Amino acid sequence: SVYKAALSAFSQNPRPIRLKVGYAATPTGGDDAAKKADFITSLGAILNYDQAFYQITLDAALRD
Amino acid sequence: KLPYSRVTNVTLTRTDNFPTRRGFGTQLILTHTAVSGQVDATKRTKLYASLAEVEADYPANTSVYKAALSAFSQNPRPIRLKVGYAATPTGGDDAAKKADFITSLGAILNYDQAFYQITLDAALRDQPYLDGLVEWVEAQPKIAMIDSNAAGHEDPANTTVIAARHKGTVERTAVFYHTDSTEYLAASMAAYMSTRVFDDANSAYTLKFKKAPGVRAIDKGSAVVTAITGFVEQTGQSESAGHCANTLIDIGDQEFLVEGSTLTQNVFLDEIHATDWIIARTEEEMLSLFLNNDRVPFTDQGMQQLASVPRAIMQLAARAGIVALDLNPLTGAYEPAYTITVPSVFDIPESQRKARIAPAIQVRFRYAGAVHYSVINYTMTF
Amino acid sequence: RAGIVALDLNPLTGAYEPAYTITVPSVFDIPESQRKARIAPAIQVRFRYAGAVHYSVINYTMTF
Amino acid sequence: EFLVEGSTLTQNVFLDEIHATDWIIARTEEEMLSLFLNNDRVPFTDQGMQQLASVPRAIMQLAARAGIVALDLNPLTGAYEPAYTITVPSVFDIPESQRKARIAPAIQVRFRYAGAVHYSVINYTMTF
Amino acid sequence: AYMSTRVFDDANSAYTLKFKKAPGVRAIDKGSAVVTAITGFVEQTGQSESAGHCANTLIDIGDQ
Amino acid sequence: MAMKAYSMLNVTATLDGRRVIGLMDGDDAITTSPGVDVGTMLVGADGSWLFSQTADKSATVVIKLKPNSPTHRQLTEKWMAQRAGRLVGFPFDFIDSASNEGGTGAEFFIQKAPDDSKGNNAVVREWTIVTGEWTPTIPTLL
Amino acid sequence: MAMKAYSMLNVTATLDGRRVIGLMDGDDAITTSPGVDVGTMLVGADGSWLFSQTADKSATVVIKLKPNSPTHRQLTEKWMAQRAGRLVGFPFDFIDSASNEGGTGAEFFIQKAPDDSKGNNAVVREWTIVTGEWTPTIPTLL
Amino acid sequence: MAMKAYSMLNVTATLDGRRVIGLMDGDDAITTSPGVDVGTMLVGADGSWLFSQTADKSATVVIKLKPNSPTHRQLTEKWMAQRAGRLVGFPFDFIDSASNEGGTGAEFFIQKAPDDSKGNNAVVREWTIVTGEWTPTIPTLL
Amino acid sequence: MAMKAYSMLNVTATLDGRRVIGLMDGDDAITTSPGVDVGTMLVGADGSWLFSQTADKSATVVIKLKPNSPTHRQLTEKWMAQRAGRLVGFPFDFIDSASNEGGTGAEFFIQKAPDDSKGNNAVVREWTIVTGEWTPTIPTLL
Amino acid sequence: MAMKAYSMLNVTATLDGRRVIGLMDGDDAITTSPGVDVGTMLVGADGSWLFSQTADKSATVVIKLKPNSPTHRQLTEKWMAQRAGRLVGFPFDFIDSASNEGGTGAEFFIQKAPDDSKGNNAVVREWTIVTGEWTPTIPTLL
């Protein structure tokens, strides 16, 4: 998830700075993965700590 | 941290908003369809603010929305459109008689008298009872206009048509003829008619004869635009050789209104609008005069005090461009444009002095013309 | 002058309305019995608070 | 090897059009914040209303330089038409009841998106 | 410290807000939707007395 | 919305956020002049003509202030900031509420400085600022 | 048709269709001046002479307007149109009805722009326009 | 500490230790002007712009004195000292106590000299001094 | 499609794909001159004559840029690329939209380099480029 | 990091460790010019062409100093050191902080010497230095 994507992220010819790492869907989607109600609540609990990011990229998991 | 919205609020939408542009009068759209949540026989007239606030009427009904969309589409926008409820009965129990329609109209003024223009659409088109409205809008300080969708106007010989049976006899209505599916009265009336301010200098739109609508297309024909609009090519406008109406023709790629919204042979719409503005201004100023001063005595002293209102409204109107410029057209010699005559109360007996109703003040005008046609000769000598 | 009192304009209409008025009772009628206390009647003053701004709204309609 | 289709989101909504508008919004918010903190107070009149309007009237000017706003020409005709207009409500009429909330009315701004090019056509008619 | 050091006899010296002011030396608190229970402030419409307690917290939005 | 009488009580000017208050007496207290002429007509020896249009959209503004005005303090701080080495824009914009006539700029710079005259009475302090772009606003209410 | 007294109520000026209304006070509100001198006399060291006539038939016009005049709005729109890149003629023509004195041009161009001075009272706004050809009309009524 | 009315009785000027007393009548008795313009805007043929800021922080001061003033004696001694060959700074500094507006310099030099006019009444004597650096003081009391 | 007035806002120049933006002030910012004379007339001692026409279709172009212009960065990169050893064409072409006057070339080369002058204000940077072929375009709109 | 206005207060020059301070007035106080032309185009009698690129990467720099400047002392010591017989490089390098435009060299040598003019006022002292290699730095901030 992190390194195999952050390596590409920090690889542009001009480089960005201060990449942000998340913790949102630490629960495996939910107790019942068929319902997304746990995922929305997981997202709702990550803004309150910090609202500085602008782009959301999920990778190596949560695919489709 | 915390979002920036705690101190501000910035949106980003995709719509079309137009300037406020206050005006003179507001129009009324009366039909049979009712929403029963706001208009059910308790509020026969309802106000609005913009197309967004239009929720009660269906966003695809033919009468209200398909005309209000055109009405709110002028490059400067009018405000506070009024929606009616008048002919909620389907004309009448016996549609052959208009007696129910006149009574329906008589029951909508009492709720509210604020509108100035009457536009009926998507229904009541060329219906026989509709003639009652023509009878009712006279002896009344309003303007009502009917946009027929199709008729035998193209033949200048028939008489069964609206503008044919009534032709030069009515002075307060006009027919915005077009083809079907075009709501046209709303496009110009109360969209361009309303958004004019007469108190400013040179703001007299005497023509209304060369004006573009919001969004609408042209009709077709070259010698058939003489049967309609009853306009002679060069000499003038003949009432016998056509029906006086409007069609929004185009000459270049430029599509514009034509014939200047006449009502009779040579009675143009702006001449009615300006006089109605003068009347409705003098009434308001007279009202604002009994309420400020305590009392107006019943003598010449108080008589000139009442005369002071027209003597200022005429002065404020000649600046706009409605009154002629103190020159007799016959000779170009001197002649006053407007004169105000005040009766002398010195002789009026006590018997009629106890009514507390003043005698009548008289005012004289001189209409200021316009131009609708030009002639050039171009004589070449070589 | 400081900016505590409103600027002589009625917010309802923007028409004229005095910002502050001072009313003084007339001593011409006060009897001798209450004139011997050496305590003056009451003067009344009218304000008009001058507002401020804590929040802003912008719309930003884009036509393309 | 290069990216293709320009990162669309719907039929013809490209990513940069979203990014630029988000930048404009996040810039106006910061500038508005930096305005209550410098001056002590912003009065509730037209005088203070134009003072708040001063921020978008500068951000739009700074953005048209970048190349996000169209260049004051109506594409339909090539005639004159303003690229951006800022409308400010008049506080002169707002009653005291809603004047006590200390929340200003809304300012409106009009854009004109500046296009780009993704495709080209040439004809090459040869006469010999 | 800021309330005292204001002179009202001068022109335009009316600090009606007291709503955007920095302290001498102190740090911020934390929370995004919890600064509504405290300070009882509605996000957009206004300030509701029922939906919070009216107080002050010295929040930060930028680094400010 | 009648075109009311002109008055200095409806003209608003903003210089880097804060307002401008202390202005000297006179019919000209804030004057903006364009950089160069809009164009130039060239007529040849035969009678033909050709007009040339410039790309210089720049302007200068002159502000006259009393010796005791908070704007004077702000400007004399900005001047010292520039002298130290810092260089920034400080946008300035002014407008008339009666006819929406005026203009705005995004990045200005102090170009001139006043002369400190003491004498027996108060004297003007004139500041001259220069922009690289200047956008006037079209007077929509005539 | 007697040669009546002069009056500003009989002078008509047209700028791209619409009239000119708001004009400042003074004995000179619309002034047109030719481009260059009509000719030049050259006298040699012997006493002979030779006159030379120019082919430059061009003129400039100066219009003074109040800060609140619809012509000011029209001109400030035309100026922005030119700045954007569009370039057109907008013919201007003016005449006096008492003596048919005046002139006309076919294609003008904005050459100067006014200075936005606010101050305590109203100030003039002067616009300078330039043509490539200028045809005066002969005063036939003397 | 209200911003009191302006008065010449609160302005203090010091020239090499001693004060300045004898000053002529007028609204301008001590005037300081900067050396050169603060900056210069250059706009190219395409419409771009570039501002240039100078490093010249220098000023000149003009003092007007009566023919009978001890400062005149001090200055006419300093002038002769310079003419003899000695060259020194003699710092000058002046300020207004009502708003802390003014400035100071570290090393000045006599640049001009007055004209000795006798005539029928008293005439001004103007001295012009020049510094290499001039530091204004920021008016903190507005 | 009237022959509008000349303006620098309708002249377009392209240097290896990207545009040219930062140009110095003056009546000559992009100037192209041909290599040699078109021909040569030779008249003998008897009076006969013979004209000779050259096959040298080459040109040079001079571009004047501000010290802060992205084209300056592009050119100073291309110069270092040439100094390293790489040699390529980088076509340059420029035109006026009002009359289709201008020209194009297929392979240019940096021939001169500017002088880095700092001084007190901004100074021009002049680049001189040379082509082996130069095709002008015929002005079809006169 | 906006491209701020140009100013001499952000240009830094270093000559063998120590800075350069005393510079004369003018728009050109430190000027660097390349050795020879970058290339040469040769067009034959048939119309073909061939471009030739030089390997001479050398430059000269001209510095203008006041008669009283520590850099003048340093340079006049270095000149005497060269005259004595010692020969070394003393690298010189200069740059602008606003756009990273400038250059550097590794080993310079004094090539010219100023003329000691006394006269009535101060006069320039011009030094000309020459390098065998000169590497410009690419302006990355445009």
Q: Which of B130, B99, B102, B111 is nearest to B42 (CA)?
A: B111
Question: At B127, which amino acid appears?
Answer: Q
Q: How far apart are the first and last CA of chain A?
A: 15
Alpha carbons H41 and F128: distance in angstroms, whole number: 12
CA gyration radius for chain D? 21
Distance (Å, whole) CA A38 – CA A29: 7
Q: What is the DSSP string of I69-123?
A: -HHHHHHHHHHHHHHHT------EEEEETTTTEEEE-S-EEE-----EE-SSS--
Phi, psi (rounded to 5 degrees) for D123 = -115, -45
State the nearest Cα–Cα gap between E53 and chain H, in angstroms.
40
For F18, phi and psi rounded to 5 degrees? -80, 160
Q: Which chain B residues touch D33 with a CB distance below 8 Å?
A: 4, 7-8
Q: What angle do CA J68, J69, J73 make, to 5 degrees?
A: 100
**SS3 for J14?**
strand
Which residues does chain C have within 8 Å of residue B13's beta carbon, measured at their own beta carbons?
Answer: 59-61
Q: How many CB atoms lie within 10 A of CB F132?
A: 25
Q: For helices B269-290 and B300-320, what crossing angle results, to 10°?
A: 140
Question: Does the beta-carbon distance from B4 to D36 stay under 8 Å?
Answer: no
CB contact under 8 A, J41 and I56: no
Task: Output the CA–CA distances (angstroms, integers) from residue B186 to B46, B136, B213, B256, G8, in the order listed.
Answer: 17, 21, 9, 15, 42
Q: Which helix (H) or strand (E) holds J62?
A: strand J59-65
Chain G residue closest to I1 (CA)? G88
Are the Cβ atoms of D61 and F17 closer than 8 angstroms?
no
Strands B262-264 and J125-131: unpaired
Chain E residues interacting with chain B (CB cutoff of 8 angstroms): 31-32, 35, 41, 43-44, 59-61
**Binary contact (F28, G123; C-beta < 8 A):** yes
Closest CA of chain J from H49, distance in Å: 9
Task: For residue I5, give the chain F residue with the closest CA.
Answer: F51
Q: In this complex, do E62 and D101 lie within 8 Å of one another by their Cβ atoms?
A: no
Return the structure tokens found at J112: 């010219």
Strand, helix or coil for residue A50: coil
Give which of H76, H78, H67 is closest to H108, Cα–Cα.
H78
- The HSE-up count of residue H40 (CA atoms within 13 Å, CB side) is 14
Q: Which residue of E has its CA nearest to A51?
A: E32
Return the partners of chain F (3 or more C-beta pairs < 8 Å). Answer: B, D, G, H, I, J
Contacting residues for B325 by C-beta, under 8 A, at least 6 apart: B318, B337, B368
Q: How many CA atoms lie within 13 A of H53 on its CB side?
A: 24
N- to C-terminal Cα separation, chain G: 11
- Helices D15-36 and D46-66: crossing angle in degrees, nearest 10, is 140
Cβ atoms of F64 and F23 closer than 8 Å? yes
Tokens standing for C49?
């608070």
Structure tokens at E36: 């509504």
Token pair of J55 as six digits: 């390997």
* Own/partner pairs, B371-380, CB within 8 angstroms, 24+ separation: B371/B207, B372/B207, B372/B209, B372/B260, B373/B234
Q: What is the DSSP string of chain C?
A: --S-B--SB-TTTS-B--S--EE---GGG--HHHHTT------EE---B------EEE--B---
User: Which is it for strands I101-104 and I92-96: parallel, antiparallel or unpaired?
Assistant: antiparallel
Where would I find the H helices in B190-338? 269-290, 300-320
CA separation for the pair H46, I25 (Å, rounded): 8
DSSP secondary-structure letter at B228?
B
Distance from the D51 Cα atom to the nearest Cα atom in chain E, whole angstroms: 16
Distance CA A46, CA A56 (A): 12
Closest B-chain CA to A48? B1
Rounded CA gap, F83 and J7, in Å?
10
The type of residue at B369 is G
3-state secondary structure D46-114: HHHHHHHHHHHHHHHHHHHHHCCECCCECCCCCCECCCCCEECCCHHHCCHHHHCCCCCCEEEEECCEC
Backbone angles phi, psi at J18, to 5 degrees: -80, 160
* Backbone angles phi and psi of F84, in degrees to 5: -65, -35
Name every chain C residue with its beta carbon within 8 A of the beta carbon of B12.
60-62
Give the CA angle between residues B88, B90, B93 to the nearest 5°: 120
For Cα atoms H51, G118, G62, give the angle at the middle one, nearest 5 degrees.
85
Q: How open is the CA angle G79-D117-I13, to the nearest 5 degrees? A: 60
Beta bridge partners of H30: H63
Cβ-Cβ contacts under 8 Å between D and G: the total is 14
Q: Nearest chain A residue to B5 by CA: give it.
A: A51
H-helix or E-strand spanning residue B8: strand B8-10
The one-letter amino acid code at F141 reads L
| Dist CA B320 CA B281 (whole Å) | 14
D34 by DSSP, 3-state: which?
helix
Tally the C-alpha atoms within 13 A of residue G91's C-alpha that lie toward its C-beta: 10
Q: Are the beta carbons of E43 and B2 separated by less than 8 Å?
A: no
- DSSP class of residue G10 equals G
The H-or-E segment that residue G93 falls in is: strand G92-96
What gap in Å lies between CA J35 and CA J130, rounded to an integer?
Answer: 9
Contacts of H76 (CB under 8 A, 6+ apart): none
Q: How was this entry determined?
A: cryo-EM
Q: Which two tokens stand for residue B187?
A: 């496009």
* Alpha-carbon span B192 to B207, nearest angstrom: 12
Longest dimension (CA), chain C: 82
Write phi, then psi, for B282 (nearest 5 degrees).
-65, -40
Residue with tokens 């082509």: I131
Q: Are B261 and B273 in contact (CB under 8 A)?
A: no
J7 neighbourhood in chain H, CB within 8 Å? 52-55
3-class secondary structure per residue, chain H: CCCCCCCHHHEEEEECCEECCCCCCCCCCEEEEECCCCEEEEECCCCCEEEEECCCCCEEEEEEECCCCHHHHHHHHHHHHHHHCCCCCCCEEEEECCCCEEEECCCEEECCCCCCCCCCCCCCEEEEEEECCCEEECCCCC
How many Cβ atoms from other residues are within 10 Å of residue J46's Cβ? 8
What single-letter amino acid sits at B256?
F
Q: Which residue has the tokens 């294609």?
A: G107
Looking at beta carbons, which residues of chain D come within 8 Å of B8? 28-29, 32-33
Q: Round to whole Å and give the CA distance between B154 and B176.
A: 14
Burial bucket for residue G18 (CB in 10 Å: 0-12, 13-18, 19+): exposed
| Residue E9 CA: distances (Å) to CA of A43, D43, E14, E33, H93 | 53, 18, 9, 40, 32
| Identity at B366, one-letter amino acid code | R
Using alpha carbons, select from G138, G136, G139, G132 the residue that is nearest to residue G35: G132
- Whether residue B3 and residue E32 make contact (CB cut-off 8 A), yes or no, is yes
Q: What whole-number distance in Å separates Cα of residue D22 and Cα of residue B226?
A: 57
Helices (H) and strands (E) in chain A, counts: 2, 0
**Residue B78 near residue B195 (C-beta atoms within 8 A):** yes
| G88/I4 CB distance under 8 A | yes
Q: What phi and psi, each to the nearest 5 degrees, are found at residue H127?
A: -115, 140
Enumerate residues 6+ apart whose C-beta is below 8 A from G71: G15, G18, G19, G20, G21, G22, G63, G65
Pairing of strands B143-146, B173-175: parallel
- Report CA-CA distances (Å) from A59 to A27, A55, H40: 16, 13, 54
Tokens describing residue F130: 């220069």
How near does any CA of chain B get to the CA of A50, in Å? Answer: 5
How far, in Å, CA of B338 to CA of B365, rounded? 5
Q: What residues are paired with C45 via a beta bridge?
A: C22
Extract long-range pairs of F79-85: CB within 8 Å, 24+ residues apart.
F79/F110, F79/F113, F79/H38, F80/H136, F80/H138, F82/F109, F82/F110, F82/H38, F82/H39, F82/H53, F83/H57, F85/J7, F85/J9, F85/J10
Query: Among all residues of chain I, which has the CA nearest to that of F51?
Result: I5
Amino acid residing at H126: E
Quick one: tokens of G3?
Answer: 């040669």
Q: Report the first-to-last Cα separation within chain J, whole angstroms.
A: 11
Residue F34 sits at φ, ψ, to 5 deg, of: -70, 160
Q: CB-based contact (8 Å) between H100 and chain F? A: no
Residue F92 and residue F16 in contact, taking contact as beta carbons nearer than 8 Å: yes
Contact E12 C2 (CB under 8 A): yes
Cα torsion B31, B37, B43, B45: sign: negative
The type of residue at F36 is V
For residue D59, give both structure tokens: 């951000």
By CB atoms closer than 10 A (0-12, 13-18, 19+), residue G43 is: exposed
What single-letter amino acid sits at F56? D
Q: What is the Cα–Cα distance from B181 to A46, expressed in whole angstroms? A: 55
Identity of residue F104: T
What tokens appear for F19 in the block?
Answer: 């307002």
Sheet holding F125-131, edge to edge: F108-110, F125-131, F59-65, F30-34, G116-117
Burial group, residue J105, by CB count within 10 angstroms (0-12, 13-18, 19+)? buried
Three-class DSSP category at G108: strand
Distance from CA of A55 to the nearest CA of E (A): 19
Do B216 and B184 meet the contact criterion of CB atoms below 8 Å apart?
yes
State the sign of the Cα–Cα–Cα–Cα dihedral C8, C13, C15, C21. negative
Which residues of chain G neighbour I8 with C-beta distances below 8 Å?
A: none
Q: Which of F58, F72, F112 sits opposite H49 (nearest CB)?
A: F58
In whole angstroms, give the CA distance from residue B270 to residue B258. Answer: 14
Residues of E in contact with D33 (CB under 8 A): 61-62, 64
CB atoms within 10 A of CB I29: 20
Q: Which pair of structure tokens corresponds to residue E32?
A: 């995004």
Chains that touch H (3 or more CB pairs under 8 A): E, F, I, J
* Facing H54 at nearest CB: one of I23, I120, I122: I120
Q: What is the DSSP string of I15-46?
A: ETTEE-----SSS-SEEEEESS-SEEEEE-SS
Element (H, E) at B268: strand B267-268
Q: Which residues of B touch F (CB under 8 A)?
A: 22, 199-200
Distance CA H52, CA I69 (A): 15
List the single residue in E with minimal CA-CA distance to C4: E14
Residue A57, classified by CB atoms within 10 Å of its CB into exposed (0-12), middle (13-18) or buried (19+), is exposed
Find the largest Cα–Cα distance for chain A: 43
J117 Cβ under 8 Å from any chain F Cβ: no
Q: Do chains G and D touch (3 or more CB pairs under 8 A)?
A: yes
Q: Which residues pair with B143 in a beta bridge?
A: B117
Question: Would the CB atoms of J6 and H54 count as touching at under 8 Å?
Answer: no
Task: Return d(Cα F23, Cα F67) in angstroms, integer.
Answer: 9
Interface test with I, best of J51, J128, J134 (most I CBs within 10 A): J51
**Alpha-carbon gap: E2 to the closest alpha carbon of chain B (Å):** 22
User: Containing H/E element for F74?
Assistant: helix F70-84
Q: Are G14 and G20 in contact (CB under 8 A)?
A: yes
What is the rounded distance in angstroms from the CA atom of residue D45 to the CA atom of residue C16?
A: 15
Q: How far is J102 from chain F (nearest CA, A)?
A: 20
* Interchain contact, B8 vs D21, CB within 8 Å: no
Q: Which chain F residues are within 8 Å of I3, Cβ to Cβ?
A: none
Q: Which residue of D has its CA nearest to G84?
A: D72
With CA atoms as reference, the chain G residue closest to D73 would be: G84
Pick from B311, B369, B361: nearest CA to B341: B361
Chains B and J touch (3+ CB pairs under 8 A): no
Residue H24 and residue H14: Cα distance in Å, rounded? 17
Q: For residue C23, which phi and psi values (nearest 5 degrees)?
A: -110, 135
CB G57 within 8 A of CB G103: no
Closest partner CB to C57 (pick from D21, D106, D111): D106
Distance in angstroms (rounded) separating the CA atoms of residues I90 and J50: 16
